[PDB]
Design a protein around this ligand. Sequence first.
Ligand SMILES: [Cl-]
Ligand SMILES: [Cl-]
Lengths: 305, 305
Amino acid sequence: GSTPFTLPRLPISEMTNSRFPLVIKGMVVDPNLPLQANFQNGRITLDGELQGTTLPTSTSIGRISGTYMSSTPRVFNPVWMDLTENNWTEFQPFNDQPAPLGCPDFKAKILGTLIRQPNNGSYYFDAYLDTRQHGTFAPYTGHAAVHSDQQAGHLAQGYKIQFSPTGIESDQNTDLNQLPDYGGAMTVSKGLAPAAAPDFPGEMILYFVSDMPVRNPNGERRDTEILCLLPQEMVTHFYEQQAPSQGDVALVRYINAETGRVMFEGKLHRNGFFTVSATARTLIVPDGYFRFDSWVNRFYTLSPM
Amino acid sequence: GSTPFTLPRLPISEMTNSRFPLVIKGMVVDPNLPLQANFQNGRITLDGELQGTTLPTSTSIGRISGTYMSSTPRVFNPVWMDLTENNWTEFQPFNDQPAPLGCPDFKAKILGTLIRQPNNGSYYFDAYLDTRQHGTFAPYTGHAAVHSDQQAGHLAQGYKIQFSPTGIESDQNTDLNQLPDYGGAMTVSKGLAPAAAPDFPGEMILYFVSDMPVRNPNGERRDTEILCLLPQEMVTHFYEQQAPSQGDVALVRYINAETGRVMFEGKLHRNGFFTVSATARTLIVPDGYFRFDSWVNRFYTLSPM
Ligand SMILES: [Cl-]
Ligand SMILES: [Cl-]
């Protein structure tokens, strides 16, 4: 009677990143990527329990929303936001959720626009959200500021506004595998999705990869990838099906879309991430799909990739 | 043995528009909206056959892509593109597809950015795509131009570039329910998704609604909605399941998410759109989900909304 667990029958090439609105360009396993992952977006259990700051669908990944504050709690001045969820429902600060759902889970100067909502006249202008700064990016406290030199005259106390990202600036310190300090100078622990980590020596996380759009001054080049543990279409699939997990870990096979050949197998863990048996950096082109084959015991040994 | 037809068990409030990257804010039936719909995005049959320019997932809705042409086939100069699909595979012009998949299917000055791809150094800058212009927007011919005053020095012949939209300018003539002229001055008919139209007097199309972001000079106000026939998550669901249709038309019920009460019923047509029995403008808040109940004969009479 219980809903069987399944994966979406879609090639990875047709999926999108769960941490930024981008297509998946492939997968990577690498001993020089972080051995454990702590992302807060793209986190769901296999039986459909959202974790961290993860949205169920791609409504507003990377966005923050709220109402304009005329006072704090080229020259770029802060635009302060009394934060809401991106669907404009209330966000309770200092509670059991690190930030509103969909809030960026990386540290960067994020470029984008600030959108005045239709009730106050649809308009938008350029702004950035610098998630490296404790003073203006502490969303766990219920407030955050974007920065803009284009806001003059367009906002008044209480206006609904939403930040929509286009990309980042990237420098020598950019590392998108580090979480921001959601509480600013104040530590936060409650409601974080836990570390995803293999428990088999010889297994590594299989990450899904996208290219992050970058706009540095004068076009300075520092190309940057962004990883996630689950493409958003897998998050939505597990959320929608709510299939009970019926074993320690899910055995999955990656199937070539053209030939139907089994390319490799992996473990899909209940906490929502993939591991494979590998020792060296391996790049997987996304012209295949994952197929759930069976629930297996935690001591199952994967065929080496 | 055949896959049963189903709808995604998600409230409409968690779905996104199939014609622009936006959340669905509700549904509308209205005798003063077009009685037939001709959108090319968000078109799929119930058994999973994509139509028009419709992508299976939200990879690149509203984008166009290609390689830079240094020659034609503030002051804003055209940036000419030898068009590809947005996944960088080849687009065959003058054939059986009106434009690359995901190409905008409305006429507007679409604001956004132009993205130089990582192989030539990740960088992006502001640009617009004016889909009202025959001379620079004829994607059926394999070429189109965006316009920019920020490109100087950043592009060379053959560079991969992608236009990503943020919103539109809107004026007194804006009407997003009219298709662009995909062939420019040359008519195009081949490969268009057909008109969606009720076949019951007393029934009207149930449209899904989003608010389009607008940026007019000086913040001039002209708020604009954009309609679609299917949210993209329904498109993806039907595409993924490939469920055979087992009757003339699908009977669906809209269920209140809180109470589980049946709010109204409608017909979900094989060509991929909803109709309901109504006479006057009716606005539906999206805090419910559609449930497939049975295949019915084409002469089935719906309970009035
Ligand atoms: Cl499966
Ligand atoms: Cl259903």
